[model samples]
Target chain A: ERVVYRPDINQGNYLTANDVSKIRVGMTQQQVAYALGTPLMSDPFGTNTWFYVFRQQPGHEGVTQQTLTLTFNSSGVLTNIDNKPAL
Target chain B: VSAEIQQINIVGNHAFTTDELISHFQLRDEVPWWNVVGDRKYQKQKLAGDLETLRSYYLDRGYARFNIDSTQVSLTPDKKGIYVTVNITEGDQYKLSGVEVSGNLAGHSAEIEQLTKIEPGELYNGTKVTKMEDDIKKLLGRYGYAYPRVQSMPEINDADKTVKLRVNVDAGNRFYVRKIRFEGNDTSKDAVLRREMRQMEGAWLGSDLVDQGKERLNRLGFFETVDTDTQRVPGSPDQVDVVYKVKERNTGSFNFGIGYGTESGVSFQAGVQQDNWLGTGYAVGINGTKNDYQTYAELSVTNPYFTVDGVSLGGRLFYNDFQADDADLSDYTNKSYGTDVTLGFPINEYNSLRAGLGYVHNSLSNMQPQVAMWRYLYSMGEHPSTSDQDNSFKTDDFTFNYGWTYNKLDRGYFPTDGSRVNLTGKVTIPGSDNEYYKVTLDTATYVPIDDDHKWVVLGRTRWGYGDGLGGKEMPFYENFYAGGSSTVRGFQSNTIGPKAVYFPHQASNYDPDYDYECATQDGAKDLCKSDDAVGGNAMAVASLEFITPTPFISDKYANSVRTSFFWDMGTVWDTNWDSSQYSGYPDYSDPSNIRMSAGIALQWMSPLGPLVFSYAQPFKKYDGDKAEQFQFNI
Candidate 1:
């Protein structure tokens, strides 16, 4: 008998160019949510800001360190959006 | 903004209780008031939908002019609690004066007219009116009108408190499918999804077929979500494309588990299963497990679309080694290695037939206790046993089998409705060294008791018959055994069947000065006897269960916990099924040989896995049947 272990390497939430192209300033919070799935983290004090985070290990391909943040106004409309390793 | 609903009060709802009204609201009591922080946060949009639901609820009950006079939501001083109140007015109830279907009959007027379920003298329900509209639309769709519009117009005479309803139907262009496409399935082959579609590319597009296609895809268990839509092809009003967008899920799993059992003691298991191996839509798995009594390893592969017409090909290789030391009555080891290949053809949407060929080699050694039974057979010269390297007896056979299955289960996991029936048989080829055939029939049905499907009644029955061909006895290892967690919960595995007689003897005896002296029992006369379950050729088991939510924990953990009251009855018997065929064997002739039990079981879906605990009372049992009061396992 032999035991072989393969570590589970996970790269969470890799967004494609098609997904990033859907995000635009002045879009509603719901629109951004639809474009980029559920946010990794959202501002706890209010619903105005969201953080989308992504990380990849060495073995995984086609994805690297990335983060995108969207800031919304009090009216729940997107005011600004920023991404690392920008698309 | 997120806020917790602390309390909801209804001021003027005389038709429904406060609790009933509260149940209608989307905002519900959070976490039993003990937890200061609750997971559910009130959403203003959901509250709006709740208001519409409440209004429709009133309209469905003949309240023609029902009004929500006012609604108030106020925050407590700490800003941690939110209170809401609603005021309603229940106006005069309206009865249906007349019901008519008048517009765009499309030459099938009679069929369309039969779609309305309301009568003139009954209460006017807005929900039924909407249902009638949908029914007419669907009925027209079946008749080649894919884009039909149905409208129900109600004229209310306030003075008499009566309403007259008229329906108008617009049968749009007859839509036919020009093409069917798959999207978002980057890994899986297009043929994998195409083979599952019930609606053909050139056929008329009916909603029913599309729905069935969706259901079939969902049943594949490979996707997280499957979404379908119909879009009109450019420049062709009557032609449309059926598009299915599927989100893939992780189809491979590596699992390692350890659990304890009443008989097997501590057991450890590990396995890797890939349902979509290499994006070919083939299934492959390898698993190995060991317990106190047995060790098993298996490798399996299945190609669901082995052919273009939805045929399946599968193969399995397995090895099993069973040691009966803990069984106490026997000290023998049985090892078996086998492989099987099967081909399946889908007969229809809900049925399939399969044919298989298999081969097995079995070796039994350390036959100290089985020597008595072997000696009996050898005296008759009925068994041709091969001596092996470990002083073992070996047998090998080539077998073939064919089976049919019909399944209409609504869902696979904890199904609340539908039924499944399977009939199968396996027989050794005539020229094979070992000659025997086995047949089995199994049927299971589930019925839900109510609309919510919270309470269910399920019943299952299995029957098996095995016998030798050309005067050769069926292999003992192929015998059917009952009991254990999946069968009668009150008994141990294989202990519900006929048992072999065990003979105990000392291989060597030591006297005061002698190194060795053979101390053997009298082989000429009958003296040695012990009980070891031998299993049986004819087997029957049936169980009925009523499942419901666990009493106290149901509200919070309704989906995860269940309580079932069940009745199990069955027995296993050898040929002359009710009587002794051999001189020394126990008689099975009594009708009282049937074993029966009733019990209550608790099942919990925990993070680890599903766990079951059961307590049973034996209604009837045979003298040799092994029975227990309680059993638990994961």
Candidate 2:
């Protein structure tokens, strides 16, 4: 009878597989925002690079973190991707 | 547990009637009346509290001699309808008969008596008596008394129903500020903060001055948070150290990027925008872009502390080749070079004034401009005497402008409280060809709804009006436009005003009967409309936003991420509308043609820079108004 109450603390974007599965080259920035959500960060000098970082600690477990970065061309079309997390 | 409270009965309440006294109890029955769905739960835990609550409510109101003799709760045979009985006893009430001043009042005894609220023949309220003692001590604390003691002694004559009170005040030792120090300013230099201090070292410690100094630092935008506390100097009884701790925020955006576009050209732009450069509190923005078809570059650096006495000066230089026709727009090109230098001085805490001197030299070329555009140049005699195919024009204007900024914002970035107002009036020299004046004002106020500022109401508006001097009109290039992320969010950028309507005529003759108003398309029958938005001289834009805590994110990012529901209303109109030139088209100068939109916006202070994303719906719009739902800013 010594159990204590513990809450599930979820943080940041819980990016699911279905949300980011459609991202590919030649897609536009508007489509990228729809697929992975308007990135939480974009390079201020330009709108070419976007970063989405998510972190969470659930049910007393250790914290988990995932990062995704999308690069777009000068025409605001997605061109490259890096640091994508595996579902 | 299956039963609910049915009815409650009260007895022995005179000054406090049954309805009034019964309202104070939590363990009461909701008897069916006007509202049957009211809370009707009987709790044993609350019965104890309800009895004690009544006893205190009586004690605070000159009824220290009152009590709850009994409270009976009984359930029926079906164990459904419960009844509660509360009995009260009220004895003699007390009143203040007189007051006697005692102890050291620091020669302000007579003044203290006037500040004291207790009076003869008044009800002896326990809470009010205690609160009165605190304010008297607070008044002493304002006069360098770090600690002051004010205690009240009450003597009751029970038979006479009267009490005599005595207030004793002792002003402790006065304290002087030994040194004011700062902490947690890793990115900000000491001088950046030291200049905001209103409380000088070795001066009598004024509590109000210390708090005001803290407020000034938080308003500077460089700090995320500023907190201060007073500590007694270790060995000194009459000296204290005031420590102001501030957390510095990232105020600089260092970014460089390269892009290639067939229209905007192969442009490589690099820039560093800093509000607090190198912690010196200087704002600087350096941007240089080399385009394949057009060339543009600019540099600006401002030292807010140019004179070290709140006087500021900034210089900006720019050169631009604007070839609008190169990108499938109207045929007009302006090759321009200019420089602006401004000086600012503080009027007081919440106000400042600034004046600027600038010069812009423009060499222009155009085959065809908008209908209104051509009329402006013709009326002002800006067109060369000889009307040729796509003639070029030159406009060199020396400008002298002035403005004011007033602010009471609690903090610099994403402030959750207070208001700020900025207005500017700019005009060129009278002797110049382009002698015109313009006025613009932007104001915003934030009202917090919660104690922790979790919810806030943001009200903001921008208004501008411009006209020409003597016989000329305001420059068409300086016209105001609305829409897009900064104004009415659902509309495309600068699409809220009147569209460009073309009027074709012979070079020398502009008779209404000879030449008809026309555009590239549908010019044969009626006026033609271009997608280009020709903004107006008069404008008003307003927004009402309710900011709430952003959901689905960690609490730590509350300050970094802002979420708001906004309703924006704005329109641009021409106060100086000329009917002879634009008679064929709808009047674009009518202010009633306001476009309004509602949306949800999210602004994030990302690691790289600030980003805003909004999805808006235009619930109200005039005909020919363009609306695009999704917009973001980088």
Candidate 3:
């Protein structure tokens, strides 16, 4: 008899201090998007706020929930950054 | 800027061809002719660099003191084109004294030493020396030195005309990935994007893995552009974050079109597809097609991550109504409705195993032509009949199959490199009214002739075999047919296989004078002209294509348009075919009986859909082979 099986390996996504370091004040949405890739999501009902969330499973070092919230003004310029302390 | 190069002339060169120097050029005549007017802009900096590149190319080939005597860039009197001229000074040739490796080896000196290609008494080739530097850096990088830098320093002895080369490697701090992040995915979930990442978190950050991950993401077809960047932590210099940035593209499409073909005649197709249904990494599509020979409708859905461990679940329900009379083959009609459920498991990054189970209900009718050829079997009572004149019947069968696929192609839609092999075996399981097993193997490979992937050699071959089991009859309709634009392009579709013997019914008063049946019985006459090809049970096809750049398309169209010259040869045969049945036609069962063709194929990735056109001629074929010199499909 011949048998075959493939194991299950679950992967996770994590964010490090270097990733959080890219966020800064007084940057355009486009520049921020370029610097950090794309945000995870923007509020569907709102236009100014973008949220980035990163999570990792066990065996991964560093912060597990390195989430960031970015707020842009009506003119599409970054006005506030909530994850500044994580850096 | 905006100057078209009408002519470029080189003088005083003895070592290399003018075409070789022109190929090293960067600024002049760089644009394809189709976009020549707007894209053929003259940049002073690039032109200067091109001259320097030409000088280095000569210098690398032992022309130690090669120099440009003069250069002139002039505009045509009419101001419509630009002309450039270069005068070169070839100097004395030099030889290499020796090549040596130094600097940080990190106790891997033997490994690094083996990478140098320069040797004593050889010509002082700069390209080989530069390649040695890159090779050493790559080897060190694989050993966890992520930022290894190798520099080649050459000591030229002017009096002796000999050069000694030394390589210096800087193995920087070893780094590992502290994390991996994704951005700009507004619609897709993070899990969906993360699963495609090859560079795992908390792993050594190898450049190869990072590059492979980028290729994988591009193959997903979900993004317009996928870019990755490394960010170094301020305090932790040994750790970096790998960020994958993506721009989303439209993953849902609605297509409706009408087309024409020589065999199928006018046809219409309409489809709606969602590749990333609800941003869940699921796919769903509904399509309908109507042609002269067949009308089909199908609904399909697939979940690529049914359980998140790379297990896929997919199903399809389809209905097909087919008639063979349009092509003048067997005058039968089959109405089939089938549903299938498939499961796929990823065996590894480059391989997968899949199994499918299904049931089909077929109701066949209008089988008069089929009955005529198998009159002996019908008289022996071996087959059921719908009526005395018709041999149609209804059958319900269970189908099950397993397949294995190994894919390492660089991209999904248009691959320029790598290879793919797929083998599948299908069977009508026991308890089915019709029981048979079919096996098929398909393989294709692409080898790039250059680093830019512009010139490539591609080869493809396919083989299929079907046989009855459990004393059941093999379905004649399931037999394989070859020779089409997609197969051997010079021949008509399904017309290269065995032809059914024509048995004239109801002899007329003029039959003796006509001698219609007897004329064909001699194995070479006009009486066999009315017969139709019945196809065969075994098939083999092989094609070799040399893909070249489309002459006039712009560089922006790059891989989207391809022009290829190809040689194809193959045949379809049935082991049981007896030439005596159709005495006038050659036996299609002999494996040695093959057909060969050569052709030119043009493929364009149009905004609406892909378009293919081929012009081919048969080099070696039997007298009755149906040949089509030109064909096109969208």
Candidate 4:
């Protein structure tokens, strides 16, 4: 049977429930990347702002926009949680 | 007196030639009382100017202690000519005793220190000092310190003939650009060149970003060379102005469009493989690529205009030893060598046609014991036989290929606008050992959504079809493959396609040629997906990409990096899906069962080579689909 392809149009990072819970404030940059995967957007001028933004637009439903922003201090440890999305 | 000067004798000059030193002088050689038409006489005041020219030149060439000792003006008896003789002394050269940084380095001491050319044993030269100053100034300009001053403080030890040099780096202030300007573009608008800039007005004057913008301008075919000039804004120490000076070219043609890659641990292919051959019309190429699955070597010569009216003729010879199973294709080893001669016609600026006749001979071996394609080849042809526990077949094909192309793209390499279409078809001769035909159409269009083509939308599609002639089936090796950077970004190369049916073991009756009975002890037909991609006769792939700027990225990479979001959909399907062959396996013949993935692909032009890295998640896949969430090509 032949049918047209229906794509969900997902973009940015895809975070799971475990990714949100495992990542803590004192986690190293490598540890955070290992837990939450690579961030989709970050501040280019400096290395602090890592924004794991995820959004999905289905064929018939309104899209869900979720974002989790993590900031690291100069020494490469997570210093603040700017935004947290319900994973 | 004749009132004419003939000879100017220079003496005691070993450092430079007499003529080289004299060229710097603008001495007047005429007489004040000459009534004769062609008399060249010396003037008294001009002698002072000549002496000054020689004085400065010797001083500039590290001869600071140089002196002019004597001058003699002699007149001839007839006075037809006068001779002026000058004598000079050249001083000893001086050397430097290393260097030290004296002032604020702006927290960048190491980089500025390395720029100095003041070694202990090096000659004390002013040019070297200025070059070192320029290097330090340029290095600091990239980090926002625009008005950095680098002055050499040399302590001359005349007794020992050495100078102790110290460089003063006063990084005064960080400056921002007041305005950005463009020049030397006659047929182009200011907006056209301005759109490619990564450096923004009112931003700090970073030389990296300025050069990044310059590189972007040069990447376009319209420019022959792009240069950047920085200027000071009067009355403002912290304000500067940037200017991009560009020289333009109307057009050119026949670029190789080659992105060299070793993606599958070797090389990957896109629309075509090209070798421009040093801008020569003659195309000469050898084994430009080789990898695990295919060992190939080729030599080719092509002149697109062997004849005047844009007609072309070319010849090629190639050999390939392909292990198909190693490529994630069906189980077979195909050894082939071929020669082809081709002709071309250029219909117009936007269109062309090509045709070629080729002679090919192929020997296939190592088809699995119960492979359906092998059994069919044996039943239809006479040269096939069961040998070494597998089927072996040999065939000769006289092939003919024809293709048509239409291109309106702005340029060949990395065009930001326009569209292109390429339709190619290949078929064997009427009564050759292999009687099959294949055709494909590949097309792409680039559209800039914004004024500054920083944001672009690209639509690309590939469609292919192949079939056997005269009630025969096409060779399995002629099938199409999908996946990889050129097709589907999230899947492995040639691994996303129809998989053939493979039986696990030999039958209990176990005659090697007679594979009718199942090898299962319980007497059940163990039909399973081979997972090895056998490819398909029909193929389709489509991609839509939103090409965007790599935002907030480091300026070092901004020149050659392209980041994009893409939706990739593709499938390879069999046209001759005879259900009796597999009986009741899941039919992969349905082309509608396409695979889809969406990802952010980063394509970088690095010093080593071109690389494409993509991280994607498959949106739709079948039961036995193999998808990689991340893949890269080097």
Candidate 3 per-residue lDDT, tens place, B414-503, comes to 788998999988898877777788888898999999888878999998888987675444676567888887767888887776555544
Of 2 and 3, the candidate ahead on TM-score is 2
Clashes (backbone N, CA, C under 3 Å), per candidate, total 2, 0, 5, 1
Residues B1-634, model 2: lDDT tens digits: 5778777787877777777777777765555477655677767776788777777778688975676787778889999888888777888789888777677776666667787745459877777676778777767766667677778888888978988877777886666677789999897789889887766665566676788788888888888888898988895556678999888878967777676554465557777788898888889988776665467788898988776557778988888876653543334667888889998877666788888898888776754445666666876876543223357777888899799988999888889889999999889886886968989999998999998887999999999998888678888877889997787799998888767774442232223444223422323443466666788888999999999988789978978999999999998988777666667677876688788999899999987778889999999987778787888876
lDDT of 1 by residue, B416-485 (tens): 6888899899999878867788999898988988778888898888889887775556776777888888
By TM-score, the candidates rank as 2, 3, 1, 4
Residue-level error in angstroms, candidate 1, position B186: 4.0
Order of candidate numbers by DockQ, starting with the best = 3, 4, 1, 2
User: Tens digits of per-residue lDDT for model 4 on A1-87?
Assistant: 011112234455555565588988888988787676455457897667788766655534666767788888898899888555534
Please tell me which model should have the higher lDDT, number 1 or number 2: 2
lDDT of 1 at B357: 97
lDDT of candidate 2 at residue A60, scale 0 to 100: 43
Off by over 4 Å in 4: A1-87, B1-274, B288-294, B298-301, B322-331, B370-372, B375-379, B382-388, B504-525, B554-559, B580-583
DockQ of every candidate structure: 0.01, 0.01, 0.05, 0.01
Among all windows of 10 consecutive residues in model 1 chain B, the one with the lowest summed lDDT is: B515-524
Alpha-carbon deviation at B633 in model 1, angstroms: 8.7
Residues B320-410 of candidate 4: C-alpha lDDT, one tens digit per residue: 7877535644346788889989887766545778898988878776654445565457546644333233556777888897899777775
* Model 4 quality (TM-score): 0.47
Among all windows of ten consecutive residues in candidate 3 chain B, which has the lowest summed lDDT?
B503-512
lDDT of 4 at A32: 85
Instruction: For each candidate in the order shown, give its overall lDDT on alpha carbons.
Output: 0.73, 0.76, 0.72, 0.70
**All candidates' TM-scores?**
0.65, 0.73, 0.69, 0.47
